[PDB]
Amino acid sequence: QLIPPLINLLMSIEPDVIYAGHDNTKDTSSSLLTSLNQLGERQLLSVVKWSKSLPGFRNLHIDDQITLIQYSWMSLMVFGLGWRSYKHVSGQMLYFAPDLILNEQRMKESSFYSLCLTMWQIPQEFVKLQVSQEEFLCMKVLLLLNTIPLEGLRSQTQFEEMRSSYIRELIKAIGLRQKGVVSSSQRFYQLTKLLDNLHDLVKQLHLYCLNTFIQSRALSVEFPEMMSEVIAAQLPKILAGMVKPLLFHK
Amino acid sequence: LIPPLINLLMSIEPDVIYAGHDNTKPDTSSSLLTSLNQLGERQLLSVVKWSKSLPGFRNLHIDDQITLIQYSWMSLMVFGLGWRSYKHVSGQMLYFAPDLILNEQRMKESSFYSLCLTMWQIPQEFVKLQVSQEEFLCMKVLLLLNTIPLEGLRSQTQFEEMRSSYIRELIKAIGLRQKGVVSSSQRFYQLTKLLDNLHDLVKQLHLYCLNTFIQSRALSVEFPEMMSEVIAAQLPKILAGMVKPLLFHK
Ligand SMILES: C[C@@H](C(=O)N(C)C)N(CC(F)(F)F)c1ccc(C#N)c(C(F)(F)F)c1
Ligand SMILES: C[C@@H](C(=O)N(C)C)N(CC(F)(F)F)c1ccc(C#N)c(C(F)(F)F)c1
8 A cells, every 4th residue: 555565575575583592591702702603694594585585686697696695794784783773672782683682781892892882873873863664674675785896796787777776665665754855855865874884884893703703713703604605705805895885975 | 335224224134034845746726825824934933033133123112013013024025025036036036935936937837826926016126126225125124114003003103203214214225326316306206106006016915815814724725823823913904904004105
């Protein structure tokens, strides 16, 4: 009815609750980091499955699909963390998973605490802007499509048409509430700017990840296989700036 | 004729360093890279010893000395490779060590021809500019002091004074041969522009290094102790541009 079919479809393909499988009996640095990595493994599997039902995605060359997933993995994860924190704990806690909800107390380490403060920016903006699920779902797809190789994608044409249709869908999502043209136009600017700023934010997560990855044995932190492959295959390249981040505003 | 500081810099240069490569067997990706890392471990140890005799260095906070060595090791190594190739084999071969010399055919047959060509650029530049030993010595010190943390060093004032001292010394080295205010002025520009450019070239070596490090077990490429220490300590941060490369030109 009032809800555009594409948005309803996106709602229906959202993943079910994902647990970190964290141990609540026995916590610590490596323990917390290991659980977060376990959660990361389950999240990656979720994004891949999700991408198989995302209208238009399966039509892109297979290599582009793999590349886009790996490129956006961290971004989609932190964005999802932002949504969950916003929806379950009014953004006042980091809701990584039902069995892994972190607050100030569980962030003893200055390095980890700083990282969390950075992630906290998303939930906070979600609360400030009062993002709707309709808007979040469309923004999530745009995130998936927010970075491309320097030489571009193999299915570049199809990629741009897809990005455009989801940009039009984000506008429709905004139209659901923001009825005014001036207000709806200003809201489009705010949401797309939030997406632009994610590049800077995620860079910090990428670096923290790679550093912990390299010192995994010494830090006693386990990194599951699927995620390990994403980190080994693209993070060094991404941190070195060997990719093309897409921006809505120059 | 030769200024005292330059004479001292020449007296503290390390002796010849061997890679310990077994040239009795045909090259393999794993054996060449492993010997390069072994040579690397030895070069690193040589740099530490040298820094201990380098005027001004020992007076910087101990943490700063460590940071500077970890930030510049790759730069110092490739620069050294450039000098050695230029002096021993007219710059027409990569003279890593007396027991590890690669002419172009050996480069083409390695699994990293492209990397070899990148490294080979330095020696060729030395041939083109006819860099003197006096200029080379001062330039090498500046490379050690060519990158600082975003927040700066603990002994920042002292660092700034030491760096300025060696820049003044480079100027003296140039004056040892360059005559005419203009040509000597242009020479300072060229050599400092060369140093600025090294940042770009070193970035390619840093990525190749990190990728190989991450995949060390699969590729059978061993990374010695101190070598692994500096890589895990700063490589990801450096690649992500979370440090301040110093530039002579805007
Ligand atoms: C990849 C993993 C890691 O490398 N660790 C060292 C724990 N880590 C990234 C880091 F940068 F935060 F550390 C994350 C793991 C799971 C989730 C979720 N959900 C998230 C986030 F996106 F929500 F922040 C991040
Ligand atoms: C660090 C090491 C490495 O990580 N390997 C995978 C071998 N490697 C860097 C690479 F990028 F070339 F691979 C080097 C090792 C020794 C030397 C010398 N001398 C040099 C250089 F100075 F010539 F560039 C580079």
